[PDB]
């Protein structure tokens, strides 16, 4: 019965879930976690990954 309202809720919630899931992607760098990239490289070579 309430498909339009449910569809709005689903679209907004999926968009947030994808926004959160992008945080696990390295994007070409050593690792997704910024703290480990800082804690396993010196500042000069960390800045390029960051």
């Amino acid at each position: 019965a309430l498909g339009k309202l449910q569809d709005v809720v689903n679209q907004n919630a999926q968009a947030l879930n994808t926004l959160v899931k992008q945080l696990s992607s390295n994007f070409g760098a050593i690792s997704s976690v910024l703290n480990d990239i800082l804690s396993r490289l010196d500042p000069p070579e960390a800045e390029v990954q960051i």
């Binding site: 703290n35 480990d36 800082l38 804690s39 396993r40």
Partner: protein, 49 residues
């Protein structure tokens, strides 16, 4: 002979940084376990707050 032909001794420390119980932990010493409060924790080399 010239250094270009001289022998160099070589050792490769291949640091396998893996998610597993770690063995070689470095010199830094521990600190007493803290709980229920905000602390810059550091377990096995993972820096966290």
């Amino acid at each position: 002979n010239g250094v270009g032909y001289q022998p160099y001794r070589v050792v490769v420390l291949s640091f396998e940084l893996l998610h597993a119980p770690a063995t070689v932990c470095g010199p830094k010493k521990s600190t007493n376990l803290v709980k229920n409060k905000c602390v810059n924790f550091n377990f096995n080399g993972l820096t966290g707050t």
